[PDB]
């Protein structure tokens, strides 16, 4: 709820307790979504704005326009305090799969090892996919499990919060001459190229802290930054994947035949 | 001088000559020798 510790206090304080906005047992995306929905409910009392926002977010997750960083779990792993091997959590599987290739990659006690979820066949228990950010960003054909993510990480808490009001959130989720198309393709390609150049300039400016250089070999040193704690890195690899693909549109025949 | 005086001075004494419009003046020819020779260096794939 909104807290007013004094009558002179004008802006309220978003004071949450126990709910998914303060627990580190989830993903950063669900925290932002839940906080936005709760603020929309407390300020406007409008259930239509919340529904539109939730449908837009679900559509973005389903398409693939997400940051891919806000979907990273982080849970402390007690690699020795477990009862057995089948009771080990999702992070322990990733930790052991990394240790098997490099025993020196063993985390400390109560370490936060991140991991993501991808798609699978029939069955395919949650522990079976459990890809780490490194494995996910280097995999050729790997996409986030939009169904699992959306349903089992967004629908239960919103269902609780909005069934205390009387609305079910699950129902909202189930619901030679050519100058037009060629020019639209050009607009898309130029927008993507400008975004890529902006990201490269940002990384080149950030790499100035170490290199103290501005010419060539600065873009080369900055091109090897794999900092998984930066949102510009995931966007950079997504832009690289987009530019290295769709070669059918980028040809001599871009629907203009020449 | 006012604007009307300038017009009276210029347009009233118009020459209206050499404007045949049937044999117009041919523009001077300027060619681009790099049109068909070879190897445009900045043409990439």
């Amino acid at each position: 709820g909104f807290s007013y510790e004094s009558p002179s206090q004008t802006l309220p304080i978003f004071d949450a307790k126990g709910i998914e906005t303060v627990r580190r047992d989830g993903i950063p995306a669900q925290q932002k979504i839940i906080e936005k929905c709760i603020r929309l409910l407390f300020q406007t009392k409008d259930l239509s704005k919340i529904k539109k926002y939730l449908q837009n977010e679900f559509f973005k997750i389903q398409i693939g326009k997400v940051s891919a960083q806000d979907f990273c779990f982080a849970k402390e792993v007690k690699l020795g305090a477990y009862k057995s091997e089948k009771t080990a959590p999702a992070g322990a599987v990733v930790v052991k799969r990394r240790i098997n290739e490099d025993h020196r990659a063993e985390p400390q006690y109560k370490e936060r090892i991140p991991y993501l979820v991808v798609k699978g066949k029939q069955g395919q228990l949650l522990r079976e996919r459990c890809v780490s950010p490194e494995e996910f960003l280097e995999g050729e054909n790997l996409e986030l499990d939009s169904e699992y993510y959306i349903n089992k990480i967004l629908i239960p808490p919103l269902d609780r919060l909005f069934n205390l009001i009387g609305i079910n959130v699950g129902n909202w989720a189930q619901e030679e001459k050519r100058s037009t198309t060629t020019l639209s393709f050009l607009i898309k390609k130029l927008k993507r190229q400008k975004e890529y150049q902006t990201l490269k300039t940002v990384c080149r400016t950030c790499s100035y802290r170490y290199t103290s250089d501005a010419g060539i070999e600065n873009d080369h040193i900055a091109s090897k930054c794999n900092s998984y704690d930066c949102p510009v890195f995931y966007s950079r690899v997504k832009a690289e994947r987009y530019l290295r693909d769709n070669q059918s549109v980028q040809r001599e025949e871009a629907l203009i035949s020449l | 001088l006012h604007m009307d005086a300038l017009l009276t001075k210029f347009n009233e004494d118009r020459s209206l000559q050499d404007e045949n419009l049937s044999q117009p003046r041919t523009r001077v020819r300027i060619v681009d020798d790099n049109l068909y020779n070879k190897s445009n260096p900045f043409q990439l794939c």
């Binding site: 991140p114 802290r209 170490y210 290199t211 250089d213 090897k224 930054c225 794999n226 900092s227 | -």
Partner: protein, 61 residues
């Protein structure tokens, strides 16, 4: 100490530096640092790794 004091997610040097000091540090793999430290040429790479570890040591304070 940072895990006990502040409550954040990853508890790495870059994450802590960004969440406490508001400084974004690039991160190079152990093989990239090795290739830079073994470059007979490209003084820029040696300066890069030197400033890398110098900033990592200065941010600990």
């Amino acid at each position: 100490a940072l895990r006990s004091d502040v409550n954040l997610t990853q508890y790495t040097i870059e994450s802590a530096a960004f969440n406490i000091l508001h400084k974004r540090l690039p991160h190079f793999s152990f093989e990239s640092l090795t290739n830079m430290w073994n470059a007979k040429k490209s003084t820029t790479e040696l300066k890069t790794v030197l400033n890398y570890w110098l900033s990592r040591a200065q941010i600990n304070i």
